[PDB]
Amino acid sequence: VTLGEVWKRQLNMLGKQEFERYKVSDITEVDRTAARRYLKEGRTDVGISVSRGAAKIRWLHERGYLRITGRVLDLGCGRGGWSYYAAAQKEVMSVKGYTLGIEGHEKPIHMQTLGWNIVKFKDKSNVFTMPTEPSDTLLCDIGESSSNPLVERDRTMKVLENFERWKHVNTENFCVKVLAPYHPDVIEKLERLQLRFGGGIVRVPFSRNSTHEMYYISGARNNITHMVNTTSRSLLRRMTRPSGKAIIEGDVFLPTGTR
Ligand SMILES: Nc1ncnc2c1ncn2[C@@H]1O[C@H](C[C@@H](N)CC[C@H](N)C(=O)O)[C@@H](O)[C@H]1O
């Protein structure tokens, strides 16, 4: 019924080469070559980011959709790309990152980029079972893709329900992943969250066309349905006229040392 639902159905029907071409079409992308080379040599001292995810929070921060201040909580921190980006910012007092870490490449990776000494990581943490704690800036980047839209809907609602649980009175700043924002249930829930907490929703250009993920943020006020639909239209437009080419820019580089 929604344009996002049409997008998801069409996406799932794409042939293999069509899918690969489509997913990068007109997206923005950071060049990860430098960071990967250094990490391969165990060079944790260097001013690099541990993940591609850092590019998303940099865009959100630099473009004024999110202020990053005080006590930062990073729910689903993974390797720590957002946590280390936050730690380098002058208004940040501390960072606590929690993540499941049920694989491997997806546990926190220690680094010595700026403010590393004010970051504390806890692996094997389920943020859904944990008690909440206060924060000034609440970040959450959880939402695991599924070809099944109903699974994506369920996962999104769970994340939003838990976000509301964690969203404290002193939480002025927030950024939550909305995996599948186009589902009517998700739109309806976000609208009620917005009445309580204000804020708005945004598409980060570093997201692949193969996901409809958007971010609910504190830094801008906008119309949820309008913003989601505009993204659905962009995604469908790219599907009918795919360039097959991403726009590559410089990675998230950071200063180094203690704070
Ligand atoms: N219930 C949960 N509790 C804690 N972490 C989770 C949960 N579900 C998923 N995760 C983790 O959340 C992470 C999401 C990642 N996309 C985060 C990337 C991160 N923002 C970065 O820049 O590196 C994954 O590593 C998941 O393992």
Plain-language structure description:
With 259 residues, this protein is α/β, with parallel strands linked by helices. It has a single domain (1-259), classed as 3-Layer(aba) Sandwich (Rossmann fold), CATH 3.40.50. It is built from eight helices and nine strands. It has helices at 3-13, 16-23, 33-40, 54-62, 81-87, 149-166, 184-197, 224-240; strands at residues 28-31, 70-75, 92-98, 119-122, 137-140, 173-178, 200-202, 214-217, 247-250. The strands form two sheets. A seven-stranded mixed sheet has the order 4-3-2-5-6-8-7, sandwiched between helices. The chain has a two-stranded parallel sheet with strand order 1-9. The chain starts with a helix and ends in a 9-residue tail after the last strand. The relative contact order is 0.22. Bound molecules: sinefungin. The site of sinefungin has 20 residues, from helix 5. It comes from Wesselsbron virus.
